[PDB]
Design a binder for this molecule. Structure first.
Ligand SMILES: COc1cc(-c2cc(C)c(=O)n(C)c2C)cc(OC)c1C[NH+](C)C
Length: 113
């Protein structure tokens, strides 16, 4: 494991703790969400993000945050605002962006000195 992989695994574990039912753990299938593949063209989930960390496919925290944002945005696009998925996606998105904020990453960058 490399330092970037350990950092991304830490952020991913913290985000995944906010989804105890595993709604974001693996891809959404059309069987459990009719028309999903017809509405969501760039699917994303925590399991795919984990595979990308293990394969060393993320060059930066910005790329990781972009996948996290895509996952939440997909749930808010497919699902209406009064649904469990939309509400959890909104809660998870705000918490993840606070955790990986520019202030937190600037403090972490300054600690690399
Ligand atoms: C009902 O259960 C699930 C629901 C969703 C889900 C997740 C999201 C983000 C979504 O937008 N939709 C529309 C759906 C249907 C995913 C699931 O598994 C990945 C499961 C099955 N789990 C064992 C709990």
């Amino acid at each position: 494991s490399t330092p970037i992989q350990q950092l991304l695994e830490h952020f991913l574990r913290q985000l995944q703790r906010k989804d105890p039912h595993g709604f974001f753990a693996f891809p959404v299938t059309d069987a459990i969400a009719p028309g999903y593949s017809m509405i969501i063209k760039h699917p994303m989930d925590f399991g795919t993000m984990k595979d990308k960390i293990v394969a060393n496919e993320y060059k930066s925290v910005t790329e990781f945050k972009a996948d996290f944002k895509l996952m939440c945005d997909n749930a808010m696009t497919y699902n209406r605002p009064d649904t469990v998925y939309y509400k959890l996606a909104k809660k998870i998105l705000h918490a993840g962006f606070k955790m990986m904020s520019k202030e937190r990453l600037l403090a972490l960058k300054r600690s690399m000195s």
